[PDB]
Design an enzyme around this catalytic site. Structure first.
Site, PDB file in Angstrom:
ATOM      1  N   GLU A 160     -10.679 -18.314   6.989  1.00  0.00           N
ATOM      2  CA  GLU A 160     -11.403 -17.786   8.100  1.00  0.00           C
ATOM      3  C   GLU A 160     -12.890 -17.995   7.857  1.00  0.00           C
ATOM      4  O   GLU A 160     -13.590 -17.023   7.788  1.00  0.00           O
ATOM      5  CB  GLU A 160     -11.151 -16.265   8.281  1.00  0.00           C
ATOM      6  CG  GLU A 160      -9.708 -15.883   8.654  1.00  0.00           C
ATOM      7  CD  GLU A 160      -9.602 -14.530   9.359  1.00  0.00           C
ATOM      8  OE1 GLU A 160     -10.582 -13.737   9.354  1.00  0.00           O
ATOM      9  OE2 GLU A 160      -8.506 -14.250   9.906  1.00  0.00           O
ATOM     10  N   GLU A 295      -2.142 -16.490  11.489  1.00  0.00           N
ATOM     11  CA  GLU A 295      -1.940 -15.096  11.267  1.00  0.00           C
ATOM     12  C   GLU A 295      -1.988 -14.274  12.602  1.00  0.00           C
ATOM     13  O   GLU A 295      -2.859 -14.533  13.443  1.00  0.00           O
ATOM     14  CB  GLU A 295      -3.055 -14.555  10.306  1.00  0.00           C
ATOM     15  CG  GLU A 295      -3.191 -15.287   9.003  1.00  0.00           C
ATOM     16  CD  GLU A 295      -4.386 -14.726   8.156  1.00  0.00           C
ATOM     17  OE1 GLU A 295      -4.915 -13.717   8.486  1.00  0.00           O
ATOM     18  OE2 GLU A 295      -4.752 -15.297   7.152  1.00  0.00           O
TER      19      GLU A 295
HETATM   20  O1  LIG Z   1     -10.288  -6.729  -4.302  1.00  0.00           O
HETATM   21  C1  LIG Z   1     -10.348  -7.747  -3.295  1.00  0.00           C
HETATM   22  C2  LIG Z   1     -11.540  -7.605  -2.344  1.00  0.00           C
HETATM   23  O2  LIG Z   1     -11.152  -7.971  -0.989  1.00  0.00           O
HETATM   24  C3  LIG Z   1     -12.162  -7.842   0.045  1.00  0.00           C
HETATM   25  O3  LIG Z   1     -11.592  -7.924   1.365  1.00  0.00           O
HETATM   26  C4  LIG Z   1     -11.179  -9.294   1.622  1.00  0.00           C
HETATM   27  C5  LIG Z   1      -9.745  -9.593   1.227  1.00  0.00           C
HETATM   28  O4  LIG Z   1      -8.887  -8.678   1.911  1.00  0.00           O
HETATM   29  C6  LIG Z   1      -7.661  -8.344   1.260  1.00  0.00           C
HETATM   30  C7  LIG Z   1      -6.877  -7.701   2.395  1.00  0.00           C
HETATM   31  O5  LIG Z   1      -6.337  -8.805   3.124  1.00  0.00           O
HETATM   32  C8  LIG Z   1      -5.531  -8.372   4.228  1.00  0.00           C
HETATM   33  O6  LIG Z   1      -5.130  -9.513   4.992  1.00  0.00           O
HETATM   34  C9  LIG Z   1      -6.208 -10.200   5.651  1.00  0.00           C
HETATM   35  C10 LIG Z   1      -5.953 -11.719   5.547  1.00  0.00           C
HETATM   36  O7  LIG Z   1      -6.072 -12.055   4.174  1.00  0.00           O
HETATM   37  C11 LIG Z   1      -7.034 -12.441   6.401  1.00  0.00           C
HETATM   38  O8  LIG Z   1      -6.833 -13.826   6.536  1.00  0.00           O
HETATM   39  C12 LIG Z   1      -6.985 -11.826   7.792  1.00  0.00           C
HETATM   40  O9  LIG Z   1      -7.916 -12.326   8.635  1.00  0.00           O
HETATM   41  O10 LIG Z   1      -7.431 -10.504   7.712  1.00  0.00           O
HETATM   42  C13 LIG Z   1      -6.433  -9.700   7.104  1.00  0.00           C
HETATM   43  C14 LIG Z   1      -7.021  -8.299   7.272  1.00  0.00           C
HETATM   44  O11 LIG Z   1      -5.882  -7.503   7.519  1.00  0.00           O
HETATM   45  C15 LIG Z   1      -4.298  -7.560   3.799  1.00  0.00           C
HETATM   46  O12 LIG Z   1      -3.444  -7.104   4.880  1.00  0.00           O
HETATM   47  C16 LIG Z   1      -4.824  -6.345   3.040  1.00  0.00           C
HETATM   48  O13 LIG Z   1      -3.817  -5.606   2.419  1.00  0.00           O
HETATM   49  C17 LIG Z   1      -5.725  -6.815   1.914  1.00  0.00           C
HETATM   50  O14 LIG Z   1      -6.313  -5.687   1.279  1.00  0.00           O
HETATM   51  C18 LIG Z   1      -6.045  -5.637  -0.115  1.00  0.00           C
HETATM   52  O15 LIG Z   1      -4.781  -4.991  -0.191  1.00  0.00           O
HETATM   53  C19 LIG Z   1      -4.312  -4.643  -1.509  1.00  0.00           C
HETATM   54  C20 LIG Z   1      -2.868  -4.064  -1.427  1.00  0.00           C
HETATM   55  O16 LIG Z   1      -2.696  -2.656  -1.050  1.00  0.00           O
HETATM   56  C21 LIG Z   1      -3.050  -2.299   0.308  1.00  0.00           C
HETATM   57  O17 LIG Z   1      -2.289  -3.026   1.281  1.00  0.00           O
HETATM   58  C22 LIG Z   1      -0.875  -2.837   1.121  1.00  0.00           C
HETATM   59  C23 LIG Z   1      -0.604  -1.378   1.441  1.00  0.00           C
HETATM   60  O18 LIG Z   1       0.795  -1.165   1.407  1.00  0.00           O
HETATM   61  C24 LIG Z   1      -1.366  -0.480   0.454  1.00  0.00           C
HETATM   62  O19 LIG Z   1      -1.163   0.880   0.822  1.00  0.00           O
HETATM   63  C25 LIG Z   1      -2.862  -0.800   0.506  1.00  0.00           C
HETATM   64  O20 LIG Z   1      -3.603  -0.049  -0.464  1.00  0.00           O
HETATM   65  C26 LIG Z   1      -5.287  -3.677  -2.180  1.00  0.00           C
HETATM   66  O21 LIG Z   1      -4.771  -3.427  -3.533  1.00  0.00           O
HETATM   67  C27 LIG Z   1      -5.471  -2.371  -4.220  1.00  0.00           C
HETATM   68  O22 LIG Z   1      -6.696  -2.728  -4.880  1.00  0.00           O
HETATM   69  C28 LIG Z   1      -7.461  -1.556  -5.118  1.00  0.00           C
HETATM   70  C29 LIG Z   1      -8.753  -1.907  -5.866  1.00  0.00           C
HETATM   71  O23 LIG Z   1      -9.301  -0.738  -6.520  1.00  0.00           O
HETATM   72  C30 LIG Z   1      -6.640  -0.606  -5.962  1.00  0.00           C
HETATM   73  O24 LIG Z   1      -7.301   0.631  -5.744  1.00  0.00           O
HETATM   74  C31 LIG Z   1      -5.179  -0.445  -5.554  1.00  0.00           C
HETATM   75  O25 LIG Z   1      -4.565   0.149  -6.670  1.00  0.00           O
HETATM   76  C32 LIG Z   1      -4.556  -1.801  -5.260  1.00  0.00           C
HETATM   77  O26 LIG Z   1      -3.197  -1.789  -4.772  1.00  0.00           O
HETATM   78  C33 LIG Z   1      -6.701  -4.290  -2.135  1.00  0.00           C
HETATM   79  O27 LIG Z   1      -7.739  -3.381  -2.581  1.00  0.00           O
HETATM   80  C34 LIG Z   1      -7.132  -4.775  -0.746  1.00  0.00           C
HETATM   81  O28 LIG Z   1      -8.335  -5.519  -0.968  1.00  0.00           O
HETATM   82  O29 LIG Z   1      -9.319 -10.898   1.616  1.00  0.00           O
HETATM   83  C35 LIG Z   1      -9.393 -11.128   3.024  1.00  0.00           C
HETATM   84  C36 LIG Z   1     -10.853 -10.930   3.430  1.00  0.00           C
HETATM   85  O30 LIG Z   1     -10.925 -11.096   4.853  1.00  0.00           O
HETATM   86  C37 LIG Z   1     -11.324  -9.523   3.110  1.00  0.00           C
HETATM   87  O31 LIG Z   1     -12.702  -9.397   3.448  1.00  0.00           O
HETATM   88  C38 LIG Z   1     -12.881  -6.513  -0.032  1.00  0.00           C
HETATM   89  O32 LIG Z   1     -14.058  -6.598   0.706  1.00  0.00           O
HETATM   90  C39 LIG Z   1     -13.322  -6.103  -1.436  1.00  0.00           C
HETATM   91  O33 LIG Z   1     -14.081  -4.843  -1.404  1.00  0.00           O
HETATM   92  C40 LIG Z   1     -12.075  -6.166  -2.356  1.00  0.00           C
HETATM   93  O34 LIG Z   1     -10.950  -5.285  -2.050  1.00  0.00           O
END
Ligand SMILES: OC[C@H]1O[C@@H](O[C@H]2[C@@H](OC[C@H]3O[C@@H](O[C@H]4[C@H](O)[C@@H](O)[C@H](O)O[C@@H]4CO)[C@H](O)[C@@H](O)[C@@H]3O[C@@H]3O[C@H](CO[C@H]4OC[C@@H](O)[C@H](O)[C@H]4O)[C@@H](O[C@@H]4O[C@H](CO)[C@@H](O)[C@H](O)[C@H]4O)[C@H](O)[C@H]3O)OC[C@@H](O)[C@@H]2O)[C@H](O)[C@@H](O)[C@H]1O
Ligand SMILES: [Cl-]
Length: 372
Positions: A160, A295
Site C-alpha cells: 500500500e 484485500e
Molecule cells: O509491530 C508492528 C508495527 O505495525 C504498525 O502498523 C502497520 C502494520 O500493521 C499490522 C496490522 O496489519 C493489519 O492488516 C493490515 C494489512 O497488513 C494492510 O495491508 C491493510 O491495508 O491494512 C490492514 C489494517 O487492518 C492486521 O489486521 C492487524 O492485526 C495488524 O496488527 C498487528 O496485529 C498483531 C496481532 O494481534 C492483533 O490482531 C489479531 C487479534 O486477534 C489480536 O487481538 C490483536 O492484538 C499485533 O500483535 C501484538 O504485538 C504487540 C506489540 O507489543 C503485542 O502487544 C501483542 O502481544 C502481539 O500479539 C500487532 O501489534 C499489530 O501490529 O502493517 C500494516 C501497516 O499498514 C500498519 O501501519 C504499527 O504502526 C506499529 O506501531 C507496530 O505495531
C-alpha cells in the site's frame, strides 16, 4: 551501486507452463484468501499469534472453496542492512510455502508488504534512490529464488505505497518499474510471469485520480493492477469513536437498526461500492488489465451483545457477499483479508490452531457471493 547485484544466475527465458495472459490467468480466479499476520509479521512468522503456514491450512483453504492465496511477506528484517542480502533460510521458507500452496492447486501472489515501512511510508523524492536500490536487490533475490514455479505463482511489487499526490505517484511509478525490471532480468519463467502493480495507497479514488501508465515490460499482456477495500472505514475497521465520526455496527439494506440508529452508515453503502468498483472497471478491466482486489474485510464486533450482535453479524456477513459479488461482476478478483484472529476486532475465518472453520457465516457469504 549501493548494493551488489543479486542477479547472479540469470536463466534463459522459459515459457513452459507460463502460457496464460494476465486476462486468462484472471478468468481462473474468483475467490482469494490472504494469509494475514503470518509471513509479514514483524519479529518472525509466528510473532503475531498465528502459527507457521502448514500444508494442512492450505488444504483447508482450497477445500473451503478458495482459488488463490495472497501471501504477504516481510523481508527487510531478514536482510543484512549493509548488503541487502536476505537470509537463505527465510528464502527457503518462502519457497517452501509457495511450493505447498501450489501442491494444493492454489494460485499464489507474493509481495513485499509494509514490511516495517522502508518503502511503503517513503514514496518521496528524498528516499527514491535508496529505496529503488533496495527494491531491486530484494526483487532480484526473491524472484531468483522463486524463478522455477509455473504460472500459479504471481508477484506483487508493493503493498500500500503511500502516494498521496502526482509527485509521489511519479516516485511510486519508478518503484514499480524497478520491480518489473528486477524480476524480468532473472530470466527463466520470470520473463513471462504475471506481475501485479499497486495503485497509490491501493485506494480506488487516488488511483483513478493519479494513475497514468503500467511500467514498461518486455513481456506482453502479463500485468494486473491492485487495489484494496475497507470502505467505509467506520464499519470495516473503526474501533472507537472520534470527534469526526462514529463507528458503524450495521450495514446493508435489511439490517439497519431502529433503536441505536447512530451505528447505521452515514455513507459507504451499496451504491458507493458499485460506483468505486466501476471506476476500476473503466480504468483497467476495459483496457484489458485485470484488477486484483488484494484485500477487503470488515472486522467482527463480538464486544456487542444481544440483538445488537445478531444484527451486526448479519450485516457483516452481507457486506462480504456484496463486495465479493459486485467485484466479480466488474472484473475485480476479490481476496479476503484474514488476520487469523478469532477474537474481537479481528478478521480470521479459520481457526489456525486447529485447521478448522471458525466463522462459517462469513465463509458462506464469500462463497454465495462467488457462486452466483
Ligand atoms: O509491530 C508492528 C508495527 O505495525 C504498525 O502498523 C502497520 C502494520 O500493521 C499490522 C496490522 O496489519 C493489519 O492488516 C493490515 C494489512 O497488513 C494492510 O495491508 C491493510 O491495508 O491494512 C490492514 C489494517 O487492518 C492486521 O489486521 C492487524 O492485526 C495488524 O496488527 C498487528 O496485529 C498483531 C496481532 O494481534 C492483533 O490482531 C489479531 C487479534 O486477534 C489480536 O487481538 C490483536 O492484538 C499485533 O500483535 C501484538 O504485538 C504487540 C506489540 O507489543 C503485542 O502487544 C501483542 O502481544 C502481539 O500479539 C500487532 O501489534 C499489530 O501490529 O502493517 C500494516 C501497516 O499498514 C500498519 O501501519 C504499527 O504502526 C506499529 O506501531 C507496530 O505495531
Ligand atoms: Cl451510499
Amino acid at each position: 551501486g549501493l548494493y551488489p547485484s543479486y542477479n547472479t544466475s540469470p536463466a534463459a527465458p522459459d515459457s513452459t507452463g507460463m502460457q496464460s495472459t494476465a486476462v486468462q490467468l484472471a478468468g481462473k480466479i474468483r475467490l482469494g484468501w490472504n494469509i494475514g499476520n503470518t509471513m509479514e509479521a514483524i519479529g518472525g512468522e509466528t510473532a503475531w499469534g498465528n502459527p507457521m503456514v502448514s500444508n494442512e491450512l492450505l488444504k483447508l483453504v482450497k477445500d473451503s472453496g478458495f482459488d488463490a492465496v495472497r501471501i504477504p511477506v516481510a523481508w527487510d528484517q531478514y536482510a543484512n542492512q549493509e548488503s541487502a542480502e536476505i537470509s537463505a533460510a527465510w528464502l527457503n521458507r518462502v519457497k517452501q510455502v509457495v511450493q505447498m500452496a501450489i501442491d494444493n492447486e492454489l494460485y499464489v501472489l507474493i509481495n513485499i508488504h509494509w514490511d516495517g515501512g522502508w518503502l511503503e511510508n517513503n514514496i518521496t523524492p528524498a528516499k527514491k534512490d535508496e529505496n529503488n536500490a533496495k527494491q531491486k536487490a530484494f526483487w532480484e533475490q526473491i524472484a531468483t529464488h522463486l524463478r522455477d514455479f509455473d504460472e500459479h505463482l504471481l508477484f506483487a511489487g508493493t503493498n500500500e505505497p503511500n502516494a498521496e499526490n502526482a509527485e509521489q505517484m511519479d516516485v511510486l511509478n519508478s518503484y514499480l518499474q524497478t520491480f518489473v525490471d528486477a524480476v524480468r532480468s532473472t530470466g527463466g519463467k520470470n520473463a513471462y510471469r504475471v506481475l501485479v502493480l499497486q495503485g497509490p495507497v491501493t485506494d480506488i479514488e487516488k488511483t483513478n485520480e493519479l494513475w497514468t501508465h503500467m511500467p514498461a515490460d518486455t513481456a506482453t499482456d502479463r500485468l494486473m493492477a491492485e487495489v484494496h477495500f475497507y470502505t467505509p472505514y467506520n464499519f470495516a475497521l473503526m474501533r472507537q469513536d472520534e470527534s469526526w465520526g462514529k463507528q458503524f455496527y450495521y450495514w446493508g439494506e435489511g439490517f439497519l437498526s431502529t433503536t441505536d440508529t447512530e451505528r447505521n452508515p452515514t455513507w459507504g453503502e451499496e451504491a458507493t461500492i458499485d460506483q468505486l468498483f466501476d471506476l476500476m472497471k473503466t480504468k483497467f478491466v476495459d483496457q484489458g488489465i485485470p484488477v486484483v482486489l488484494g484485500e477487503f474485510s470488515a472486522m467482527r464486533r463480538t464486544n456487542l451483545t444481544g440483538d445488537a450482535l445478531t444484527l451486526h453479524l448479519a450485516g457483516r456477513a452481507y457486506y462480504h457477499k456484496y463486495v465479493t459479488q459486485q467485484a466479480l461482476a466488474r472484473g475485480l478478483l476479490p481476496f479476503y483479508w484474514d488476520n487469523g484472529g478469532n477474537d474481537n476486532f479481528s478478521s480470521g475465518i479459520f481457526n489456525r490452531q486447529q485447521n478448522t472453520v471458525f466463522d462459517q457465516q462469513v465463509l458462506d457469504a464469500l462463497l454465495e457471493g462467488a457462486g452466483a
